[PDB]
Amino acid sequence: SFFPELYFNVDNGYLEGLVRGLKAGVLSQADYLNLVQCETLEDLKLHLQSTDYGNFLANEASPLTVSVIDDKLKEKMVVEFRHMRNHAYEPLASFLDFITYSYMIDNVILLITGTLHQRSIAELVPKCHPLGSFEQMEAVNIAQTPAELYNAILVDTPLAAFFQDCISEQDLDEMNIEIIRNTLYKAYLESFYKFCTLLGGTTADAMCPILEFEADRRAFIITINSFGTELSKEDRAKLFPHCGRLYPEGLAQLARADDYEQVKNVADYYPEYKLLFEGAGSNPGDKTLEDRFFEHEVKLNKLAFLNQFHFGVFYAFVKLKEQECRNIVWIAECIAQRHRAKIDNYIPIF
């Protein structure tokens, strides 16, 4: 074993304690029930004020909206993550940067989509996710030139490594943005898994399961969604990350798969995914496959907190708080639309 116990706290111990303290503030099942019992968005804020969230929503206008609540939750998480990153050192700094690459991918996809449609990049900036902000000025004032934007990404963005999967800037106008996004995400997930493995120790032990499940769920959902589309099997198989546990012949069977029944047969070989697919009834009124995978992801991120001397705590906390913000936004949506029947679809955490 790497014996991280000896040296982890030299640099990252204070942040380990800090992130665990932050995780202790994620709403529990009782708090989720209390928020569910509300009647209006104002009452939602009122109940939420008793949790760790506090007065994050007191300043904003009395006529609360789901949009306002969602933006405030996003802003709070961005602030906390930015504080942790600012107080992090080299290895944990790279870990947190890898966490942010996920949103930087979507942001660059937005940038290229707007540019190919001749829209100002500066005017596209506000829609980008805060955690993936392109503070670099090389990819700004591009004059709506896709070639200039590709060069800017390559020169002054951490995505230059993932953009070597493509062959040239003509690929931006050639390939569909979804395929670009998913190729970028495959490369990013593979690099993230490699980095975690190189870190080794408790970090690898507690983090590789999460990335592996991410890869497997990406494979499953890409297969299930590309059935009725023009996305050929050959071009689909290029989008499966190789980190998952399906790499030997599992991804191959999925690539050859031509129906949800075949996808389920492939998933059967792995019991962990077998249960998720069995519970994913997919008919109206019961948990869908995406919801089952969300439950499994939350479970894995929670188990990430049973290890101690590892960076996986930060990724798990970021994902758990993302899920919590999604849950609160969903509860606010149910309150606003008066659809109390489905108000229990939120995936609980802790």
Partner: protein
């Protein structure tokens, strides 16, 4: 009479017993404790049951202490080179066997405690594996006693 340097190896035998058995017990207790503390936020009622691997690591420390006391009581400034070597070997045996058993107990106890938080049925399996790892230190103590008494 015997060589002036003879007692060096018996001294190092007692020291090696104590130091290496202490290393093993310390690692076992540290790993098991960092497992127990992390788990207990999730399953607070399992702490007392999960304390057992810590006790096994302490037992490794006890074996090391026993052999070290034997050597330090049987060690004199004029002990034959033969007896000094015997005590060096007994010390190395107990210390390194306890080191291995402590590493094994730390790993097994941490993993088993985390699993028991998730799977209560695994407690007995964890206890079996911990006994099997503790029997290694017991073997080391047996060999150390044979050597030191011989």
């Amino acid at each position: 009479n015997n060589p002036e340097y003879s007692s060096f190896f018996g001294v190092m035998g007692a020291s090696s017993a104590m130091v290496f058995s202490a290393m093993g017990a310390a690692y076992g207790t540290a790993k098991s404790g960092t497992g127990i503390a992390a788990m207990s936020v999730m399953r607070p009622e399992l702490i007392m049951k999960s304390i057992i691997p810590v006790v096994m690591a302490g037992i490794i420390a006890i074996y090391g202490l026993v052999v070290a006391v034997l050597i330090a009581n049987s060690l004199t400034d004029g002990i034959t080179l033969y007896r000094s070597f015997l005590q060096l070997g007994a010390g190395l045996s107990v210390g390194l066997s306890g080191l291995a058993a402590g590493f094994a107990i730390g790993i097994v106890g941490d993993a088993g405690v985390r699993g028991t938080a998730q799977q209560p049925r695994l407690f007995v399996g964890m206890i079996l594996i911990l006994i099997f790892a503790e029997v290694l230190g017991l073997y080391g103590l047996i060999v150390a006693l044979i050597l030191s008494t011989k």
